[PDB]
Subunit: 390 residues, 4 copies
């Protein structure tokens, strides 16, 4: 029952919300687990939300200090898609402060990276059993995708980075079978820096849209042949810039070099679906802050430096906080002849942005899937009144 | 294993309570989810309560403002029948502020309507996967039944309305197979306005008892042939008026026109079971407010304008709040040769009626099923002391 | 897979605790459901605690007034044996203020009695579906066992009473098949009053030890032939009195008449296992109040008026509150050649006895099973500090 | 499907964290169950945490006094590995204040010891049904392993002790089949006192590393032949002392006699894996207090009195509290040709050590598994700020 990526992407004319956990609203009174960098992964039995918990709930004195990325009290949880995460409905999968997870059609592989900054180790599980460990190779925050990996013919591909966040680093493309590394390649191609890849599968290939945290406000792209287990890397061709922060959009993009100019923030995790005319990119509305979120239809954004926005859908209006965004697909919808693009938006609340109200940072989640036909409109922000928490 | 509606309704001589979640009483301390417009739907594995949550619990500061019908923080939950809804026992099914759900014998179809008032879209799921989307066709609060739909031979019928709440609107009768629209008809017949249909199946047909929010205090009725997938509409014939608000009962009803005179409130969701002599209608006891609830036996209420009440059972006494009511049936009770009529009553607490005590509105649920033999008596109100919440 | 009562009782030399939910201790902070009159019932998949909830938790303002026996907010819950009951782990089975439940080997039958005092109806379920209703026949608190019923060859026997609590009443022995009454007998024999029977099965028979709430401090006994579906009734023969309240033990008991003299309280639910020399009776230690609990070995207590106590085990010491007690047996322990006697003790806290500390009454549960070999000793009281709740 | 111990231990070059429940951090607000002496046990369907609860949660007034070891309100719970224990996710398995549990490949056997200090009885369950009881034989706190037992060919071995904690006592090696004792041996060999054995299986044998609470700061060891069901006992040979408290390490250890000198505390539960060069022992970092935890690689520690530490991994740094530690193995990882050593560390918080902050004592849990390859580093302490609880 190994997943074979034998399908193309569905045409997407618009997006609808399939899940929204409202975690922060509920978190005002219920024991909602403090989380960040969430994502969604499906498998033959359904879909679940995944997130990095902070070993505390919101209305808990330990919520103080949760802006920090890496502690010994972090781990990966999965909770039913659409539900806010509480202890009672959450599966504690592994311990660590960076993660990825995916199902190969028979078993789920999940990875957590734990330990000190200079001496970290990735813990790899298959079917919920420890299978292998991978030591830091650069000695500086070994880290991975923060969204679902993708599998094909029993092999799952994972993108990991080790080394400096703000200059040249050491990224590897890893191929796993049953939670064991069977092949590794150092990053090839023109992408100068790779972080937090959002990946999806199609026709025996995997496309990853990533984060250049070094120089680029245009997103790097990794292309993987899953049968040959080889890859190459590049940048998106559009001058429509979709990282944050970023300068104004250019008339002409650069397929092979990072476009610089970014005001301050070096990056945010994002995604895109590259399918010629059926090409959609995600983007914070603010070019400076993680506020708002919009889906842009940009035909051939992956190949044409003169590509332009043709359609736009607002997901979160610019008066509200967003954050990470990543791709996922139900690869086991056997009643559809195509893979339907889906994505999630992390809705970050608290610090640093709301430091005057609150000592914690957490997030809620909204998840969207594509429709081949025109849809209506609507904004889906976090919805909590932060003052309630002061 | 497709459900075939090959049975008639059981004779009902009286009603007994099968479930009562006591949500508001529990909500005084436990993290009960704030809800409204609930219902019940069965399937081969059992029955569950369905409701529209408000993205908060009662003892949560976000409970303030929950009188509002449509927000981005609303969604559909299912919880085990009889239990009050908390995060731990609730399945978050879709996002939206109007819904319906039913099982076809093999898979469950559920529908949520989400988005802005003028630009709404229905999201349709089959077996918990997004299958189709339906855009607003009138551009004014696309909306549906707020109780279970009904299926036959793999086809499920749904009633939806789009347009003005207080004048002529655009109602469609939709036929689904595996979450895909296979046929649509504009409303036919003499019913002038259709809202919030309560439907049940019998002998390859579906009967819907609805809400005329425009002119009528007598309830419109939709009759559907499930094999031909055609329908017609009408009003109940009785002069015993069962909407709220309503004027006094008339000696002679009108099978083909709305009976006007209503004091204030234009309508409330209700139901009826039309089976000749075995005909029962539901009704708030107050003709002005959503207080009390009574079951009335009115032989041939669906066909005879001179029909009269012959039996009455009080369900909720007039010193207590009620609200919506709708029909449901366990269509998979294979040990019975007949379909037993069941119904639920929404017990609304808080605003607007209890505005001086509280800033929220939510509801509890009581569910009843029929008995072919005389039963005893009893009132089953919400049971919370609203002052405890001040 | 119908249960056939083809086994005898195991020899019991002593008792050990298999479950203790500590509900009141936990109830100091956790949302423990307020309950009373609990019991235990097994089936092929395991054992669960059953209880009558009060539609509230302890640390909830609605806990005020829970001394009252019959409200519209009462129902039957089942929770995993050994766990304290919370909403998250409890199955809300039916609505009512008196109940019984048992598994026939294929399906579980459960019964709740609901409604007004003079107009009550029993609701009967089989495999969690409403099957039949039974109207009050005497018009005064139709009521039943408050512990598990027993089944044989597809037929389950239930004892119900309707009428006066303090004088002659109308008790029926009912035989059910798949939640349908197939036979009823009026009480026969010398027992003058029957309440709250504790029943167990053995060798195609059912023995019930009950409560004479009228005259007798000695317990009435009902003997049922399950193949013939006929019964007879009697009193325990011992002069060792095991109801509460009761006068001092007599040298000579009465097999056929109630022994009077009771100080105040007319009765409490209790049990016994009648197996010649292997005969054990339960008993509050105080002859006046529901405090303490002790198991007494009284050979031939069921047949010999000169029977004497030979062994004694203290379960709850006399400095602590007890309450109801009843019998249960795992009839699906296929690895044992005998049915092992088990019983539960209801540990009542709050009113009326602790009225000066608290406005609620609830209970915790301790459950014991027999051992064919000598065991050690120990007291297992509720364990809550009632002052914590003031 | 009986487990056959047909495998050897995997080589371990280092340890990674697979689970950390963060119970005390969560316990600041969520209803976390108060526990101590936890452990981990696997079976064909996965792994779960086991612990002795105290019949209360942390933020509960009944948490006051939980330093006491033995009450009637103690029992054994199992909760999903990695999750903190709450009522909603915990299985209440038996009642008592000492326990062990293991799966034989077909059914789980679990044991609780309950009752008074001089008159205790072990309750034994197989497949969650009471199977046998074992009365105290020395009349002084009958007690057992506080970690998982081990099974082979349908037989599970358990180590129990009865008698004085601070002098000669009466230890038995018990062999169970389906929860029935089939063989018992009095302790043989040179070990003078045996408490709280940590056991693991390998090649049809079981090795237990225990606690000499009488004289020895070096750990006693029990060797069991599982086919012959015979055992012998000894001490670890190393002069590297791994009990607490303990004097400084000696150059030469004693294979056959306890090494004395211990400052104060007579012992703590610990473990070791004895596999020649692949030999690892656990140890509190402080030789006086239960603070810190370190894994030491000591080749042939079980056979060579001149054995030395060669590798060391810090698990919990010496600024943090630890406690018990024990061994466990997933014996049903069929994709590995070897049994991978795993262990847990109990992280005790509260009294006696933090008596000035708090009136309770509880623990959190961290669980580690081996890796055949070098890993990174990191400390994994409890992580709660005890001042938050004052
Ligand atoms: C959340 O955690 C932060 C950090 O612990 C808390 O802020 C800190 O509060 C302490 C007082 O409890 C401040 O300590 C002070 O430090 C100065 C030196 O900077 C010293 O001279 C004083 O005697 C005092 O000890 C500390 O400065 C302050 N830190 C910051 C960054 O403001 C905060 O109060 C916590 N929030 C809640 C709601 O508890
Ligand atoms: C539940 O929500 C309502 C609405 O937010 C709260 O009522 C509102 O309370 C605010 C004060 O916090 C009032 O604001 C005032 O508005 C007037 C103008 O109308 C302005 O001149 C004042 O300076 C002040 O800002 C607001 O009027 C009031 N709204 C209503 C409709 O009464 C309510 O307090 C909330 N309940 C709880 C328990 O928090
Ligand atoms: C639990 O519920 C009981 C019953 O409602 C509460 O006791 C009652 O408290 C009210 C005051 O809130 C008393 O009302 C008084 O009644 C007298 C006539 O008897 C009237 O003249 C006074 O003006 C006043 O309204 C009532 O007597 C009293 N009932 C009893 C039996 O004492 C009790 O306070 C509740 N407990 C908690 C903790 O809220
Ligand atoms: C946790 O439990 C302990 C033990 O019950 C509490 O400490 C105790 O507090 C009581 C007062 O409530 C003290 O009682 C006093 O005893 C002396 C004789 O020793 C007597 O002369 C006084 O009249 C008074 O009754 C008791 O000494 C004290 N025990 C200890 C060991 O300090 C403690 O307060 C509880 N913690 C919390 C937060 O409630
Ligand atoms: C899917 O994976 C299998 C296993 O790796 C591939 O089949 C193997 O192909 C190699 C040669 O390329 C043979 O030596 C092995 O014996 C094959 N294994 C089996 C089990 O048949 C297969 O080629 C892969 N599919 C694709 C499309 O590449
Ligand atoms: C139940 O549904 C099936 C499928 O729609 C109906 O069977 C189809 O009937 C049409 C003609 O009306 C044929 O062309 C199809 O080939 C049939 N499909 C199958 C799978 O047999 C069937 O008629 C419906 N039942 C009723 C009573 O109307
Ligand atoms: C167990 O129950 C079955 C069903 O009631 C009994 O079998 C029936 O016996 C009657 C005569 O007594 C026959 O007329 C029926 O045809 C039988 N039914 C079946 C399905 O065989 C059976 O006798 C009962 N067992 C005992 C020991 O009394
Ligand atoms: C595993 O256990 C079984 C059962 O105890 C052992 O098989 C038994 O061996 C005895 C003689 O030693 C025979 O008398 C029994 O008839 C056997 N029972 C069965 C079911 O075959 C078996 O020897 C054990 N395995 C090992 C390796 O010792
Ligand atoms: C360490 C570099 C990495 C990518 C730039 O930083 C990320 C920045 C993130 C951010 O920009 O919000 C927060 C992430 N938690 C962090 N990842 C880790 C493992 O700490
Ligand atoms: C928008 C018209 C519609 C039917 C009249 O209003 C209903 C009135 C209801 C009512 O009268 O209580 C509340 C319902 N939540 C609402 N439905 C929606 C989708 O908002
Ligand atoms: C109504 C008579 C009946 C038996 C004497 O009273 C019982 C007394 C019980 C008791 O003595 O504690 C409380 C029970 N809840 C009650 N049963 C019902 C249905 O109310
Ligand atoms: C009774 C002797 C026994 C072993 C020394 O004491 C243990 C000491 C333990 C300890 O040193 O922390 C606490 C354990 N809870 C206790 N075991 C029991 C059953 O009480
Ligand atoms: C409805 O939403 C779509 C975006 O999906 C937008 O193009 C369209 O203009 C909207 N219609 C109205 C009336 O706002
Ligand atoms: C019992 O209830 C029925 C209604 O179901 C009613 O007709 C009857 O009069 C009631 N009996 C009494 C005595 O109240
Ligand atoms: C142990 O308990 C039994 C009761 O089960 C009792 O007979 C015996 O005397 C007790 N032993 C001691 C030493 O208390
Ligand atoms: C990483 O951890 C190992 C222990 O597992 C240790 O031997 C090594 O020195 C560490 N490396 C660094 C750079 O700290
Ligand atoms: Ca960037
Ligand atoms: Ca109307
Ligand atoms: Ca009596
Ligand atoms: Ca020692």
């Amino acid at each position: 029952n190994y997943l074979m990526l034998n399908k193309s992407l569905c045409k997407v004319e618009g997006w609808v919300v399939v899940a929204k956990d409202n975690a922060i609203r509920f978190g005002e009174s219920e024991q909602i687990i403090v989380t960040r960098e969430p994502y969604v992964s499906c498998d033959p039995l359904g879909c679940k939300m995944y997130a990095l918990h902070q070993g505390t709930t919101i209305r808990n004195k330990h919520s103080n200090g949760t802006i920090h990325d890496r502690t010994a009290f972090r781990g990966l949880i999965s909770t039913p898609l659409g539900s806010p995460p509480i202890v009672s409905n959450s599966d504690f999968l592994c311990v660590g402060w960076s993660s990825t997870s995916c199902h190969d059609g028979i078993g789920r592989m999940t990875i957590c990276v734990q330990g000190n900054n200079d001496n970290a180790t990735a813990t790899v599980y298959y079917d919920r059993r420890l299978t292998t460990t991978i030591k830091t190779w650069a000695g500086n925050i070994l880290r991975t995708q923060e969204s679902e990996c993708v599998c094909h013919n029993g092999t799952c591909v994972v993108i990991m980075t080790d080394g400096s966040a703000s200059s040249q680093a050491y990224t590897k493309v890893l191929y796993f079978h049953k939670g064991l590394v069977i092949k590794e390649e150092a990053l090839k191609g023109s992408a100068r820096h790779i972080e937090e890849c959002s990946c999806y599968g199609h026709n025996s290939k995997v496309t990853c849209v990533c984060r250049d945290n070094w120089q680029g406000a245009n997103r790097p792209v990794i292309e993987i042949d899953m049968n040959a287990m080889e890859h190459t890397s590049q940048y998106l061709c559009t001058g429509v810039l979709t990282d944050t922060s970023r300068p104004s959009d250019k008339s002409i993009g650069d397929c092979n070099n990072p476009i610089t100019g970014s005001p301050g923030a070096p990056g945010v995790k994002g995604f895109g679906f590259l399918d010629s005319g059926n090409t959609w990119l995600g983007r914070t509305i603010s070019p400076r802050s993680r506020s708002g979120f919009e889906m842009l239809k940009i035909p051939n954004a992956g190949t044409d430096p003169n590509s332009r926005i043709t359609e736009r859908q607002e997901i979160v209006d610019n008066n509200n906080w967003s954050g990470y965004s990543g791709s996922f697909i139900d690869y086991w919808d056997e009643s559809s002849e195509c893979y339907n693009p889906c994505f999630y938006v992390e809705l970050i609340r608290g610090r640093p942005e709301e430091a005057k109200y609150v000592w914690w940072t957490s997030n809620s989640l909204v998840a969207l899937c594509g429709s081949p036909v025109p849809v209506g409109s609507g904004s889906f922000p976090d919805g909590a009144q932060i003052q309630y928490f002061s």
